[model samples]
Target: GGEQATAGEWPYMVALTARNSSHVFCGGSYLGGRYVLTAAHCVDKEDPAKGDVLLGAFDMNDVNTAERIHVRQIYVHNSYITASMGNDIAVLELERDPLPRRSVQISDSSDFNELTKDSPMTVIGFGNRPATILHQVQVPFVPLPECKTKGSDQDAKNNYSQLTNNAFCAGSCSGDAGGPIFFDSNNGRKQMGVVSWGGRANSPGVYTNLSVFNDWLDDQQLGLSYRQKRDLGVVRPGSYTHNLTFTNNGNADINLGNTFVFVVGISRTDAAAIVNNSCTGVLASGASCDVEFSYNITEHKQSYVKLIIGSSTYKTGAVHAYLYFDALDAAPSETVSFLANLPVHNTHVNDHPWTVVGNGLQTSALPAGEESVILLENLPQGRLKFHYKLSSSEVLDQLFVYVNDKFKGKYFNNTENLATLDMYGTNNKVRFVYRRHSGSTDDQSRAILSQISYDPKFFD
Candidate 1:
């Protein structure tokens, strides 16, 4: 009963109909990965095998029902009794994914305080209307307690005698049942409610509060389990390794895309690298496997790193893990010469073993039992004030500084590696050999020593 929505206007709004039908018996929001959320009342009695979901249809007649997504399973909230009761939500698992369609994110507890009374929300559906074109209307959220009196005090008409805790009173109309109530949130447009009942006289329509049903919604991830999604826990800034488990909990067999598993959404791709995996390929029903990831957690102070679970596949819902790096944060470029302005820049240079990371030389994540030598030939090594960072297998990998065939000091990631080191030497032959061992946790271990400091004084 609102204005007509244009093609691609509300793309996430899906229509529920029978084979070769234009009438939208109900509507739902496509939640990506062949999943849609609708009203429990819409499917409680209806046979899902007889229904189909139209993914991208604007003018009801344009979509071919043959290509429409077939509903294989209809899961209604176990708590649902009726439209007027608690949890009027349901999840429709489509037999197959759309040719390709985007799913709108569901609203969560974070939005519970926001979009209170009078906040504008977009209600989209083909409900209680005369024609086929999808209808959209701008509606304001009204008070729930006041909504119960829609027909009692104001208009003598009420959709439900009693609205439960799960009911959200926005605008309503019958036939629009199960349609999505979208609110353009601070983060994005999230489907906040599901049309359930009401839309009578003075009383606004009652929709199911989606935020209250996340536990039930996320369970549809089809049984993918990990230690935690948001819980990376707390750890120091250095080399760390964790094995995340991906287990299929549902009846159906899940398969993870194995070609390449990685962390998307950010630029720091090197932070957590997958060292080993068993999460690739098919994870049959009720089975779990472990995949190990090695992270070079930097001291970004209040730092956070998101781990892209190896089980991230359309077949097995989205799995994610996170890490919080406690920081020791700090300063930058003090580009003073290492040889007291010695044109011997080439002299202190090396037949280097480390690789270039962001143009800064660093050891590889591999422990090949290699000697990364930074050779200093023409040398008058005064107090060699240098900088270093270690991300290795704890005690396995160490950076040893040699001054004239003699060990000045062996440095590792301790308070001793407070970035810079001061050591006095002669017109000495200096060799900065970073020793990395094998046969242990390569957890892809590493160390980086980049230095340039003034000779402060001259005593050869």
Candidate 2:
């Protein structure tokens, strides 16, 4: 019996099924989202229109949660030879969107150079006796010379030649054809080969080496690409600077003359206000260049920068950054205020809760005999400066402050100053309370809290 795999354990695993019978005949790995990588032999002479790809499905019997997509196109290596099984690699293009489940990344040439005959590997598939469940077995990457010798021996006895520059040998069992051969690396699991054919029970299995086809694969994946970066935190209304890197991860050189940057969801006026570009020239294979830009945001909103390569206007690479004018510098000794508005109902800013008035944060008021309150939780250890002003000299309203549900202070009209409250602990909570007199029609009748700022006592 083979070990059963849990759902989503191998997210890149895909099953190639016959449309008529809806039965899986071969296994493949999801590559580049829209394509499925498999052995050419698995698709040889097979009509792509008669096939479908089953994604995110672990068990053949349970496919309700799987995405069954129609195959639109098939691409087999031009040099593939049926007699020798050389260049036995194929890519299937699915008509539907790529499954959100994790997909495997192909090993680069550098990664292949690091592999040795003793390198630990694993072969997984839904094959042979234990075909009901996805089966996996640990195997070692056999050296090319040893693989060739084994192939020669098997060919002399069985009339089969498994040696090829684009192929390698690994321990494989029947029904594992077209499955993925993976090796563990520092980054994670990488697909190093595609199961091609197997010899005797104890003999090594031949697979198409993916590293040999890296250049071909890169050509198939040409277009816009970018390096991912973390969120740009709280940018102020001045010249904000950041670098956007464009690289030619492809195998061929890309002409920079056809490349251009297009602004998205931002006005031309705004673009002229803060956007600047410094990118120029071509990018060679494995080379990278920077697109430096500075933008001054007048207000708070979401915007994006799109990098277009070649003649296509479609975004090849894009980055999204948010602008917040209310952002204040974080300093231990400096005092800052949260002057933004908070809502009577629960509202969030950057996932944090707050209450707001007309461009100003409402600290105290009685909308309908009920006190308005704002609560900040899980705050960093710091000193909070709560600035408040009496609505009117004659208005009799009291402002109350609390820390961790414990009353900290109660103030009246004469008390117009910064309330420095100390917050201590890994997690702390601050609450503001406002009590208003009944039948006060003047907006000034309610005490107004203008801003709230915090200066950290220790780094968070």
Candidate 3:
């Protein structure tokens, strides 16, 4: 029952200490984020009592590498009446991220079937007296029935009636209450139970069978992430479909109810419904789910039906997909790219043809045969912003020096032929007048900024 663990040996091993001191009191395992899984009896002495969760600690005497995070919130199982009775599990919410050295993998329902009676499982903790170095012992698995019967003899203090199906017996020590009872698997060490209760070192200690609460754990730790923004980009009034894959990047499963791509309330009146479904209900941790919805655009909507994972469980806020519908002018979308939106100062030089645009800055392209030549005499004073790119067949064919402007010299390309036109003095301001001859119908290079043919850069 006594084996000293070396530094970095048990990466997932955790220590629970007095809130105001470093004295080890209970044990727990870091499950990532601010959550630490421990025995309900450890923290529920008083529901939400104070303590500190220590991670990366191999020895109590030396904790330079260990992280001590204060427990801000404590949660015990709702049904946890007492330690000996049942539901002897709790969760500790640390005040901040543990920036964990290592995290313990939680067991799923499959683990229950995979692990058999007498299967080799190890339990680690500070100690019954809370030792200076961590300690661990291998305690073979004991079936539930065997656990209750044996516990009666070892735990007669509770009249031997101190066990529930939520628990299984392993070697439990007095001070090892909240530690983990886990087994080594090919993937990694996966925890199957929390050391909740037991009698002596020899008699199998009782552990809260974690597999029994897989669903509940999901609710306690639900979070989501998704790929970035996608747009329906201008479409005609008809039916369309979009597919978005979401990740249940949490520690547990999230049942797929109606969370598929559903319409955000903005355009409920517009016709939209779920069609093809590939989303599997049990969105287990680290798993991906793909779902698509049909948007029957009956009419143009200013506030097109936005996307959201509006399911029962994730009702408050879940991942979102930013898609839009367009009779023509679809609402703009967002991006976290090189050109985050800069202030656009597109005032008029004349009610003329050229219009200013871009996440950065761009101007109107020349239209067909309108071979109109307009010298950009005075535009906004700012850096020329462009997400530069050009097609093979297109080439720059015109030039313009900002007339009556300070930098009245000839400007050309830095590298690419006249693309990213080298501008001067606009920085403090960097401004340049990009001139192009649109209407090269073959490659359409003539529509300068109008057509992307010769257009070097633009962003939305």
How does candidate 1 fare on TM-score?
Answer: 0.48
Off by over 4 Å in 2: 128-130, 151-162, 199-202, 222-460
Total colliding residue pairs, candidate 2: 11
**Could you give the C-alpha RMSD of every candidate to the true structure, in order shown?**
25.3, 23.2, 24.4
CA lDDT, candidate 1, residue 368: 57
- As for model 3, its CA RMSD to the true structure in angstroms is 24.4
Cα lDDT of model 2 by residue, 33-121, tens digit: 56788887787535577888887647777776677888765656646646245788877767656657677889887788778877878
- Please write out the lDDT profile of model 3 over residues 1-460, one tens digit for every residue: 5687777777877788877577877788887777788887777533243577778767777776788887665555656757667777777766666673567788877777677788888877766524777777787787766665663343353523556668776644423668888887655678988876543444656778887876655444564434323434335556777766766656766666544444444444556666666564567788887777787664433234545454556533343445543333221232112122333222122111233345322333543322222233222333343343222233443334342223443323222232332333232212233434353343333222321111223322
For candidate 3, the clash count comes to 14
Best by TM-score: 1
Candidate 1 segments exceeding 4 Å error: 65-67, 153-161, 172-175, 223-460
Q: 352-379 in candidate 1: lDDT tens per residue? A: 3455455245654554555455544445
Q: After superposition, how far is residue 399 of candidate 2 from its true place, in Å?
A: 99
Ranking by lDDT: 1, 2, 3
In candidate 3, how many Å is residue 198 off? Answer: 1.6
Kindly report which residue stretches of model 3 are placed more than 4 angstroms away from their true locations once superposed.
45-49, 151-162, 171-175, 199-202, 223-311, 314-460
